[model samples]
Target: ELQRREEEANVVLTGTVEEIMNVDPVHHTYSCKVRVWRYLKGKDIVTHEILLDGGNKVVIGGFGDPLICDNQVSTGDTRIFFVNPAPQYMWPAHRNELMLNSSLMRITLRNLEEVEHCVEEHRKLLA
Candidate 1:
């Protein structure tokens, strides 16, 4: 499953959170901005102006809503993100943007090597 996820990602980026604007209750999520510094995978996309996807915000967790797994990011936090094409289930406004593929899969660790290793582990499964 992990390998399949990596294979399906539209963009796998090693990015840093640059700014977190504010939470929009109407959307029930926190608006965030990130800078894609480099790529651990999916190098086809050269555009650096990638939004966080799903409206560039973090989602709040609640029953009957999308489960929030790993969306807590602040300014300057560097992490590995597996972003896929935006699905149709999100707010109508952000349906056209990319989104985290799932709630249970993301990496936010201080060890850069460990993070890279994690990406590699899944990448190897692609073969």
Candidate 2:
């Protein structure tokens, strides 16, 4: 995606999890909407609908505990390292089964730098 902020640096923006929403039982992955302050994106903000694959229980927070998420929310924050979107499966709360197991192209970020993330989210919109 094209980042409009920070003079267009080709860098990966990293931040902590701000919040989480509905989590599934069978897969245990939390389908969440997140807000992150990007450095290269000029703190331009990258908010995406994502799921933390694997693990059913939200021990303290929803997933792993990031300092910001830990301080704000009761459930521990999900662990998110500096990594790109996996193009194969997904971040399942469970190790084996997938939440939206079709292809990485299926359940991808809705917006990256304010760009359309997935082609399938609105496949019908395509010509």
Candidate 3:
């Protein structure tokens, strides 16, 4: 999933969740607004909002089920986001196709640096 999404994504970013804008259990969708700290790849954007679906219990079993990422994010969370071109049905809501689990603190920073190194190695190899 990571490899596929990585290819599909237009932007790769690390950001802090400015706020968890919304969560709809009925629709099984959650939206988050983030303030970007760094661009791992692609165009730079200061802010981006992502809406994701699926959870322990979501009300879908259709095309949307494939879009659901099994992850939870909230305000103040920090993560690496793989942002894709939005689908018509999802419109502007669904931008991020994948998110590395949102974690902060010294350990998280260290982990991000390690992962960033790995990604750089791959990019260098490809280039």
Candidate 4:
């Protein structure tokens, strides 16, 4: 599943949530200002501040159970993000706006090695 998402992702990186930029109460969605720590992919598009969508919860199926992926982000929280460019039609857009590939793709920093391994594996496949 990690490899699959790595293949699907346009941008993958470890970043820290610098600030909470906006909160949409009606949509239950929010955006954050993220500072890139390292780019496992899409380094060419790197920016000082990346606007990231959060707040919506994601669920994944486990062995006869469900795993919840929540985007309860806070300032200074760091994580790996698998994301894509935000749609051009999105409101209040920023130059470096991005949307998460999945709520599950927002990985904790402790699993950095796992995410890096997936990137390496994908790079091998591409080669």
Candidate 5:
């Protein structure tokens, strides 16, 4: 079917705000060390949706298919394959303008370097 044909597998790494892709016209891109994911999911997380700066948010689960998005939407949060917008993974259309520039940044881990390497390369390769 068309949906099966359109499915895509994207491998992404979640990282810190490495750099903004387009500085002008409101576009930004971040880099994150790649995190975990389920198998056979499409690239860039097909089920992913953008959560705007405000509280407005949308979640979608793309299971190799497209369900009609209509007025009578599902009542609650929809499950969709998403690579959490690692500060570095967000590719914002409005670029750096949408991003917040803060001097005080916090890293999540004390032993990130070790943790990164500890993920067994061959064993954790999910199908």
Candidate 6:
């Protein structure tokens, strides 16, 4: 399932969260600057520095619905992220921002190996 998701993702990489910037206080929307360590796919679309958009909490009353797959991340946190293009309506100022593919499959220390293995397998298939 992870491998399939990785394949479906526009950008797949392992990165460290550099900083988190608040965008909207009412909706609790924020943008994270990530420093990429490795790119398993879509290196052309993602660069060394990428912006990620996610909300801290679900907004019950808002103009736009919060992403259910959004997960809270702290500075210096390292994890593999399966990313997709952020909606144009989310952030108009940033063109490089991206969002998580899913929160349930968000990779952490516990499943980093599994995610890496899937990335390796996908690379082999492509090669």
Q: Which numbered prediction scores highest in lDDT against the true structure?
A: 4
Q: Count clashing residue pairs per candidate.
A: 0, 15, 0, 0, 20, 0
Give the Cα lDDT of each candidate. Answer: 0.52, 0.29, 0.47, 0.58, 0.25, 0.57
TM-score against native, each model: 0.53, 0.26, 0.52, 0.67, 0.18, 0.60
Candidate structures ordered by lDDT, highest first: 4, 6, 1, 3, 2, 5
Runs in model 2 deviating more than 4 A are 1-12, 39-80, 86-127
RMSD of 2: 13.6
Q: How well does candidate 6 match the true structure, expressed as C-alpha RMSD?
A: 7.1
For model 1, give the 10-residue run with minimal summed lDDT: 56-65
Residue by residue across 9-127, what tens digits does model 2's lDDT show? 22233334444565556534444333333332212121232243231221111233132222232223322222233334443442221122111111224334232322223323755
By summed lDDT, which 10 consecutive residues of candidate 5 come out lowest?
96-105
Candidate with more favorable, higher TM-score: 2 or 6:
6
Give the local distance difference test score of model 1.
0.52
lDDT (0-100) at residue 79 of candidate 6?
62
Q: Write the per-residue lDDT of candidate 4 for residues 27-51, one digit (tens) a residue.
A: 4556676766677776554343343
**Between the candidate structures 3 and 4, which one is better when assessed by TM-score?**
4
Clashing pairs in 4: none
Candidate 2, 28: how far from true, in Å?
1.7
Query: Which stretches of model 1 miss by more than 4 angstroms?
Result: 22-27, 45-68, 87-92, 103-127
